[PDB]
Design a protein around this ligand. Structure first.
Ligand SMILES: Nc1nc2c(ncn2[C@H]2C[C@H](O)[C@@H](COP(=O)(O)NP(=O)(O)OP(=O)(O)O)O2)c(=O)[nH]1
Ligand SMILES: [Mg+2]
Ligand SMILES: [Mg+2]
Length: 425
DNA sequence: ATTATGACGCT
C-alpha cells in the first residue's frame, strides 16, 4: 500500500494541431475556412492521396489515406488544397515552417519534445509548482478552464455535460494541499488552456491537448475530445477508462505487438492486463514490453519528456509505384539528384537556423516485387552539402543492386535519402 | 498506387 508508487510524480501534456495541414491552407486561403476540405499530395492518380481532413469533411466520412476522387463521392462539395510540388516531388516546407511557429510558442511555457510535425509533449511539472506557489492557496475557477473536459465526469447538450463534469471536479479539489496529483493536473490544465490560447492568438491555429501524468495517458486523453478541446485524465479515472479501452488504442500497441497481446492472453481491453503478473507479461512479450505493460495497464509510464524541439534526422523520400518504377540508370540518377537537391536546401537552412551539420547519409531503396519496405539500406559519409556529391555517393552505394547486362532491374519503387548523425556547428 | 517522413528497438 504505502510503497507501491503510482506514477503521479509528473504532469505531462500532449498538444496536437487539429487537421494541421488543412488549417495551414485555411489560414493562407480564407475561402477554405469552415468548409469541408482536405489536403492532398499529387493530382493525376485518382485526384491525389489525402493526408489531412477538416472535421467538416470528416462528418461525411472523408479520411486520410483516401483517394481524392473517392472522397468527392462521399463529399461532393469537398475543397482540396494541393501540397507544393518541387523537383517532381512533394514539398512540405510550408508545414514544417508552420510547425516551427507553433513549437516556438509552446517552448515559452515549458520544455517540449517535438513528437511530430504537428504535435509535442510538454513536461509541466515545474511550471505547475511555480504557478501553485503563485496562487497562494487560491481556489481554481471554472473560468480558467473554458475548454477542459474531465474524463469520467459527470457521474452520479455537450457544453452542459462538460461544465457539469468540470464543476464536480473543481468542487472536490483540495486546494490547500500543494502535493495532491489531482491539483497538479488541474493547474497543468489551466496552463495548457493558456498555451492553446497563445498558439491561436499568435498563429490562428487551433489544437487539442491531453493532460495527465505521463506521455501515453496525455496522448490518449488528447483524443477523447477533439476538436479545439483538452481532456484531463487523472490517475483515478484510469480503471474505468481502461476497462473498455481496446488495447490497440494505446500508443505503440496499435500493431503486431498489441495483436499478440490480444491473441496470446485472450483479452480485448487495456484493463484486463492488470490480471497478469509482471513475470507472465515479460515471459510472453520480453522483459521490456512486459515491465512496460504491467505498469501501463495501471496508468503508470516512465518514458521522459525528452527536451528536443528539432528533428534528429532529415529525410527525402519518393515512391515510384506501379509502372512508374525506375528502370534505367539515367532515371535512378536523375531522381537521386532531385532528392539530393531538396535535401541540400533543407540542410543548408537547418545548419543556418540550428547550428549543426549532419555527418552521415543513409540511402534506402525499394525494388519492385520486393515484399519489404526497404529492399536495402546503406550508409556513407556526409561531408559537404552538395547535391551532386550526395546523389553520386548514394548511387555508388546502391549501384550493385542493378542486375542488368544502362538498364536497371529489379525496378525501383522507392528512393529515400536521410541525413543523420548531427554534430554541433 | 495512400505518400512522405521520422523515432526508436533489435541484433
Ligand atoms: N505526407 C504525409 N503527411 C501526413 C501523414 N499523416 C499525417 N500527415 C500530416 C498531415 C496532418 O495534418 C499532420 C498531423 O498529423 P495528425 O496529428 O495525425 N493529424 P491532424 O493534425 O491532421 O488531425 P487531428 O486533429 O486528428 O490531429 O501530419 C502521412 O501519412 N503522410
Ligand atoms: Mg494533428
Ligand atoms: Mg499529430
Amino acid at each position: 500500500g504505502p510503497h507501491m508508487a503510482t506514477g503521479q510524480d509528473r504532469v505531462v501534456a500532449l498538444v496536437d494541431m487539429d487537421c494541421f495541414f488543412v488549417q495551414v491552407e485555411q489560414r493562407q486561403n480564407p475561402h477554405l475556412r469552415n468548409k469541408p476540405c482536405a489536403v492532398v499530395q499529387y493530382k493525376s492518380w485518382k485526384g491525389g492521396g489525402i493526408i489531412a481532413v477538416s472535421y467538416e469533411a470528416r462528418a461525411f466520412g472523408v479520411t486520410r489515406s483516401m483517394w481524392a476522387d473517392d472522397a468527392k463521392k462521399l463529399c461532393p462539395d469537398l475543397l482540396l488544397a494541393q501540397v507544393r510540388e518541387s523537383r517532381g516531388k512533394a514539398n512540405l516546407t510550408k508545414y514544417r515552417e508552420a510547425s516551427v511557429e507553433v513549437m516556438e510558442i509552446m517552448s515559452r511555457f515549458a520544455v517540449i519534445e517535438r513528437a511530430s510535425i504537428d504535435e509535442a509533449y510538454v513536461d509541466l511539472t515545474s511550471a505547475v509548482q511555480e504557478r501553485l506557489q503563485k496562487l497562494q492557496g487560491q481556489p481554481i475557477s471554472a473560468d480558467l478552464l473554458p475548454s477542459t473536459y474531465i474524463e469520467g465526469l459527470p457521474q452520479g447538450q455537450k457544453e452542459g455535460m462538460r461544465k457539469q463534469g468540470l464543476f464536480q471536479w473543481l468542487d472536490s479539489l483540495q486546494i490547500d494541499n500543494l502535493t495532491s496529483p489531482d491539483l497538479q493536473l488541474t493547474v497543468g490544465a489551466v496552463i495548457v488552456e493558456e498555451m492553446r490560447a497563445a498558439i491561436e492568438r499568435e498563429t490562428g491555429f487551433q489544437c487539442s491537448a491531453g493532460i495527465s501524468h505521463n506521455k501515453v495517458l496525455a496522448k490518449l486523453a488528447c483524443g477523447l475530445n477533439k476538436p479545439n478541446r483538452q481532456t484531463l485524465v487523472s490517475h483515478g479515472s484510469v480503471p474505468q477508462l481502461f476497462s473498455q479501452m481496446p488495447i490497440r488504442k494505446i500508443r505503440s500497441l496499435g500493431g503486431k505487438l498489441g495483436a499478440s497481446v490480444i491473441e496470446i492472453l485472450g483479452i480485448e481491453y487495456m484493463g484486463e492486463l492488470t490480471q497478469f503478473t509482471e513475470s507472465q507479461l515479460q515471459s510472453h512479450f520480453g522483459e521490456k514490453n512486459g515491465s512496460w505493460l504491467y505498469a501501463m495497464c495501471r496508468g503508470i509510464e516512465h518514458d521522459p519528456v525528452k527536451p528536443r524541439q528539432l528533428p534528429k534526422t532529415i529525410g527525402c523520400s519518393k515512391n515510384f509505384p506501379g509502372k512508374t518504377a525506375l528502370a534505367t540508370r539515367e532515371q535512378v540518377q536523375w531522381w537521386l539528384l532531385q532528392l539530393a537537391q531538396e535535401l541540400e536546401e533543407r540542410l543548408t537552412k537547418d545548419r543556418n537556423d540550428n547550428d549543426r551539420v549532419a555527418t552521415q547519409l543513409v540511402v534506402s531503396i525499394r525494388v519492385q516485387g520486393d515484399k519489404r519496405l526497404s529492399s536495402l539500406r546503406r550508409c556513407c559519409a556526409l561531408t559537404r552539402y552538395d547535391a551532386h556529391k550526395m546523389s553520386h555517393d548514394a548511387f555508388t552505394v546502391i549501384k550493385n543492386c542493378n542486375t542488368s547486362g544502362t538498364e536497371w532491374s529489379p525496378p525501383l519503387t522507392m528512393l529515400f535519402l536521410c541525413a543523420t548523425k548531427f554534430s554541433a556547428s
